Every structure is written in structure tokens, then in C-alpha cells.
Amino acid sequence: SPSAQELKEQGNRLFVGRKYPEAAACYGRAITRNPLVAVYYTNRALCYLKMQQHEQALADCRRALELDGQSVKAHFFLGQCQLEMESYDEAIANLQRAYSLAKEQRLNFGDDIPSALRIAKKKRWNSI
Ligand SMILES: CN(C)S(=O)(=O)C[C@H]1CCCN(C(=O)c2c[nH]c3c(F)c(F)c(F)c(F)c23)C1
């Protein structure tokens, strides 16, 4: 029987291979072993976003945030999901929160978060 961490790594590898439902199922098996690890929910949320399952992605972000309020990924994925759902004000605030958390945690995503913010703010401006 695989361990929870082995299933998380298998899901991560399947995600790199663009096998999104298969990766999401691996994270579900990891959650069966240990449902108190935020990263299983953040990683599954991005799978759901890639599968256009926005409501399921939002729910996994909420499960992750109840376990790790400092999660850069949960805020970033929540913001990207809200952007796709046209919830622009919410998306921008979550992306800005991911930026602040990433800076406080010394995480390096290059210019991804400011670029995502401009994409979100430009899309918001174009809609209004
Ligand atoms: C499903 N999983 C295999 S996963 O681990 O969620 C895979 C992710 C790993 C990190 C990089 N990925 C990204 O999509 C990011 C690209 N830019 C980011 C960024 F600026 C962030 F703030 C952030 F939180 C991110 F996750 C990303 C993939």
C-alpha cells in the first residue's frame, strides 16, 4: 500500500504529465491516509482548476486554508480560480495576499504574482 507522501508525489508527477484527473485521484488517496495536510488540497485544487471544475477547486482551497492560513498556493490558486469565475475584486485581493505571503516566506516565483495581478486588474478594467 502506498504512503500518503508517496501518493502526493505520484500526484505531483502525474500533474507534470498533464494527467489532471489521475493526479486528483492520487491526492484523494493521500487525503484518505491523512486529511490534515493542506498541500494535498492545494495541489488537488489546481487539478480541479485545470479540469474547469471551479466550485471543486474553491472548496479545496477552503479546506487548505483551514489547515494552513499562511499558504501561498492556496491564496494564489483561489485568486486564479476567482479570476476565471469573473470575481475580479476577490481574485485581486487573493493574488495580492499570495504576493505578501510569498515575500514574507522568501519564496521565488519570479514575476508570476505581479504578472497575474496585472492580468487580473487588466481583465477587471476591460470588464468595467
Ligand atoms: C498540482 N501540484 C503538483 S502543485 O504543486 O500545485 C504544482 C505547482 C507548483 C508550484 C508552481 N506551480 C504553479 O502553477 C505556479 C506558477 N507560479 C506560481 C505562483 F506565483 C504562486 F504564487 C504559486 F503559489 C504557484 F503555485 C505558482 C505549479
From Swiss-Prot:
From the Swiss-Prot or TrEMBL record, state where the protein is found: Cytoplasm; Nucleus; Mitochondrion
Residue positions, PTM Phosphoserine: S1, S3, S127
One Gene Ontology term of the molecular function aspect = protein-folding chaperone binding
Give residue ranges of the TPR repeats. Answer: 4-37, 38-71, 73-105
What biological processes does GO assign it?
A: cellular response to heat; cellular response to hypoxia; cellular response to misfolded protein; chaperone-mediated autophagy; DNA repair; endoplasmic reticulum unfolded protein response; ERAD pathway; ERBB2 signaling pathway
Q: Which UniProt keywords apply?
A: Cytoplasm, Disease variant, DNA damage, DNA repair, Isopeptide bond, Mitochondrion, Neurodegeneration, Nucleus, Phosphoprotein, Repeat, Spinocerebellar ataxia, TPR repeat, Transferase, Ubl conjugation, Ubl conjugation pathway
Q: How is it modified after translation?
A: Auto-ubiquitinated; mediated by UBE2D1 and UBE2D2 and enhanced in the presence of MAP2K5.
Give the CC-aspect GO terms. cytoplasm; cytosol; endoplasmic reticulum; mitochondrion; nuclear inclusion body; nucleoplasm; nucleus; protein folding chaperone complex
**Annotated consequence of substituting K8A:** Loss of interaction with FOXP3 and its ability to ubiquitinate FOXP3. Loss of interaction with SMAD3, HSPA8, HSP90AA1 and HSP90AB1. Reduces interaction, ubiquitination and proteasomal degradation of NFATC3
- UniProt-reported outcome of changing P35S: Found in a patient with progressive myoclonus epilepsy; uncertain significance
The record's tissue-specificity note reads: Expressed in differentiated myotubes (at protein level). Highly expressed in skeletal muscle, heart, pancreas, brain and placenta. Detected in kidney, liver and lung.
Keyword Ion transport part of the UniProt annotation? no
Q: What induces or represses expression of this protein, per its UniProt record? A: Up-regulated by inflammatory signals in regulatory T-cells (Treg).
What further fact does the record state?
Answer: Antibodies against STUB1 are found in patients with chronic lymphocytic leukemia (CLL) and in colorectal cancer patients.
Q: What is known of its domains?
A: The U-box domain is required for the ubiquitin protein ligase activity. The TPR domain is essential for ubiquitination mediated by UBE2D1.
Q: What does this protein do?
A: E3 ubiquitin-protein ligase which targets misfolded chaperone substrates towards proteasomal degradation. Plays a role in the maintenance of mitochondrial morphology and promotes mitophagic removal of dysfunctional mitochondria; thereby acts as a protector against apoptosis in response to cellular stress. Negatively regulates vascular smooth muscle contraction, via degradation of the transcriptional activator MYOCD and subsequent loss of transcription of genes involved in vascular smooth muscle contraction.
Query: Which disease is given in the protein's UniProt record?
Result: Spinocerebellar ataxia, autosomal recessive, 16: A form of spinocerebellar ataxia, a clinically and genetically heterogeneous group of cerebellar disorders. Patients show progressive incoordination of gait and often poor coordination of hands, speech and eye movements, due to degeneration of the cerebellum with variable involvement of the brainstem and spinal cord. SCAR16 is characterized by truncal and limb ataxia resulting in gait instability. Additionally, patients may show dysarthria, nystagmus, spasticity of the lower limbs, and mild peripheral sensory neuropathy.
Complex and partners:
Homodimer. Interacts with BAG2. Interacts with E2 ubiquitin conjugating enzymes UBE2D1, UBE2D2 and UBE2D3. Detected in a ternary complex containing STUB1, HSPA1A and HSPBP1. Part of a complex composed of STUB1/CHIP, VCP/p97, CHRNA3, and UBXN2A that modulates the ubiquitination and endoplasmic reticulum-associated degradation (ERAD) of CHRNA3. Within the complex UBXN2A acts as a scaffold protein required for the interaction of CHRNA3 with VCP/p97, this interaction also inhibits CHRNA3 ubiquitination by STUB1/CHIP and subsequently ERAD. Interacts with MKKS. Interacts with DNAAF4.
Q: What is this protein called?
A: E3 ubiquitin-protein ligase CHIP
Q: Give the organism the record lists.
A: Homo sapiens
